[PDB]
Amino acid sequence: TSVKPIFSRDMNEAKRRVRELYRAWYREVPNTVHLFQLDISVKQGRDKVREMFKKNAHVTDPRVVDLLVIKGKMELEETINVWKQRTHVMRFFHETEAPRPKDFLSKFYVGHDP
């Protein structure tokens, strides 16, 4: 499996490109949250940005890390333009509950569930 690379030869440029992506997302929040006329503080949106980076801790392969950086760069293009809208950014937020449980007791009463 001597696979062709994408962007990085090892994990070093992978970490460098994803930290550059996170740099762009930190400096990308206030312009969009002031432009799109949202209802949410800047710090809460930045915390969901860092939470979405925290979701992907198990990602190992350099192809996959580079492909996540490609997806993030494409979405940052579509959010530095207004191709997307308020609906999509509020769809990144999960506000309209859906308070769907995790306890086995609450998976038992409200049941037919694992």
Partner: protein, 208 residues
Amino acid sequence: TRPTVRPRNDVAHKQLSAFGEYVAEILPKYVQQVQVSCFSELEICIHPDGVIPVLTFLRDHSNAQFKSLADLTAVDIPTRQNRFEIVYNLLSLRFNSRIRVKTYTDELTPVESSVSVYKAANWYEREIWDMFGVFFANHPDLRRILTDYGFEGHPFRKDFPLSGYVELRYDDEVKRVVAEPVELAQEFRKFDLNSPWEAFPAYRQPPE
């Protein structure tokens, strides 16, 4: 026989066999299979490292113009080492002939994005990036086309099901459109239609 059976051609089949053998000889570097079916349209089947060389050679060399492009499709097949199949389909203007140029690839290894020799393939390449995931190195813009912005998954796969993982409705609580896990109103009763008794005996692979 004389009616009601579509008559086959002979000399066009001979010429396409000769031309496929011609191409297969004069490019020993990127040739695996050439084949002709009964309805006489040429097929070339290619390792994915000479895509721009084969398309430049099949745009010029003056005994094969083939100036018209079609469809690119990386038609998804499971079970294989290489799922995705890039399928070029070319038509010539001075010749009246049809070739299919099928090169193969897997889920992650990119190909060289042949937009620089055929300008038609730009939106085709963007579309097949959005629907499959065959990444395209040396390409200007990979945006998403035929999909929603906030949607992802490359949904023409056999993994993504028929109905989606997303559903949209409206609420007046926050005065906007929200997404939900999907809730079909009908089962989509799938029809088992796999008949017994050897539908075509001529296409019997060697049994394991």
